A paper describes a structure:
Strikingly, isothermal titration calorimetry (ITC), structural analyses, and mutagenesis-validated modeling revealed that the CSP repeat can be bound by around six antibodies suggesting that the repeat may potentially crosslink multiple BCRs on the surface of a B cell.
All of the polypeptide chains were modeled in good quality electron density maps, except for residues 134–137 of the light chain. This loop is located at the opposite end of the FAB fragment to the variable region and not directly relevant to antigen binding. We found that each (NANP)6 peptide was bound to by ~2 FAB fragments (2.8 repeats per FAB domain). Our model predicted that the interaction with (NANP)6 would be mainly between CDR2 and CDR3 of the light chain and CDR2 and CDR3 of the heavy chain. These cyclic side-chains are hydrophobic in character and are buried deeply in the core of the FAB antigen binding site, into hydrophobic pockets formed by Y38 and Y56 of the light chain and the interface between the two chains. In contrast, the polar asparagine residues on the sides of the helix are involved in hydrogen bonding interactions with a number of polar residues on the edge of the binding site, such as N57 of the heavy chain. Due to the twisting of the (NANP)6 repeat, the binding epitope of the peptide is 2.5–3 alternate NANP repeats, with a symmetrical epitope available for binding on the opposite face.
Author numbering:
A (entry chain H): 1 to 134, 137 to 219
B (entry chain L): 1 to 212
Write the structure that this text describes.
Amino acid sequence: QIQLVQSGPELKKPGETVKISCKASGYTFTNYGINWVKQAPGKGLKWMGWINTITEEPTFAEEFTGRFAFSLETSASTAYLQINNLKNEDTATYFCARGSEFGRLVYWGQGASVTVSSAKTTAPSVYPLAPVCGTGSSVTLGCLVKGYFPEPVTLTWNSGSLSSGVHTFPAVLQSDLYTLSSSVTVTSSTWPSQSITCNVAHPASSTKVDKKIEPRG
Amino acid sequence: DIQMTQTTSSLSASLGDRVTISCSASQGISNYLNWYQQKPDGTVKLLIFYTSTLYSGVPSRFSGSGSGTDYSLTISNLEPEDIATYYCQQYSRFPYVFGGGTKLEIKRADAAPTVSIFPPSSEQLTSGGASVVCFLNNFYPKDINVKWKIDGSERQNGVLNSWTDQDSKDSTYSMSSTLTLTKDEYERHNSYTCEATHKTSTSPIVKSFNRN
């Protein structure tokens, strides 16, 4: 029943302030402490520090002193992580973990993503990718998702009915915008015999796009 | 702060085999070390605390050992659900420090990449853009180098690459290389090739097209 619930994803400009909450439940809140862990995208876990839930006193690591603050509200059983004057290096996922005996980090939170950028909310440009008129057993189709912000976006083939032979590539940043691509490989006897539609949905801008892949010509 | 270093960042092994992940420290932490597992979806769970005490809910095929500065995590019967990134953590003296982390990957038979090249969409060309996409799907091992030769000359800048993690199904790898440039730049030349240099072949695999 022990669980740590964190707030949703955050989108801030450089120099702004972000506040991350960590709701504790299923136990006595004042019996254990809360740890905070930073993880940059593609990087390893970094122990930021922990806060005593009785004395409300934080214990930060080496690099997390100055613009970082641990806080809590005893009546609401919720810990808080605040970062002031946000920078590009602050772009990471921040986990909260309950501090048990033997200095172990147990009952981790789902993590709260923080994105520091100046980019505005931008809808993706869904583009169909068909091969050249010029053979073989199988045929690979594609779907280009260019220049959107922020994450995430959802890409399915034929309303999720087409799952096998699908490679959805991780989003890559280019001029502060995300670009995603996905490949689908099917037999020659089903395309262009049957409709292959790329289903791209970007909820941040309320965008839903269905894109059929047509033969070049 | 103590420097917790894991000498191996990437590790490959066949299913069923025994794997051992080491963890080194700059100081003696006196068996005050913990092991964690981070599944591909990002979720983190405690495996072994206090060097050897398996945590509640952890399979018996997990084991940890070591003393002083050197410690190790061992998985006897490697299973597909054990494919994750493992971090070591000391708690002798504050502040706590995680290790670099070791990514675990499944070993399989080598496979040649399936190279597919794609011309800019007609819908994109109307927007002034012209992305040339090159798919390199289902290959092994992970190591691979791409080369965008344009008019016989290698195009260095303007190349946007994306790599997938190891496939959950066939344990292969895939890459998406995109030559991002405008319509004007796309019409200045007329020879877009895509060289795929991989272990499986002496000569690289070449896919190309032309807007003739």
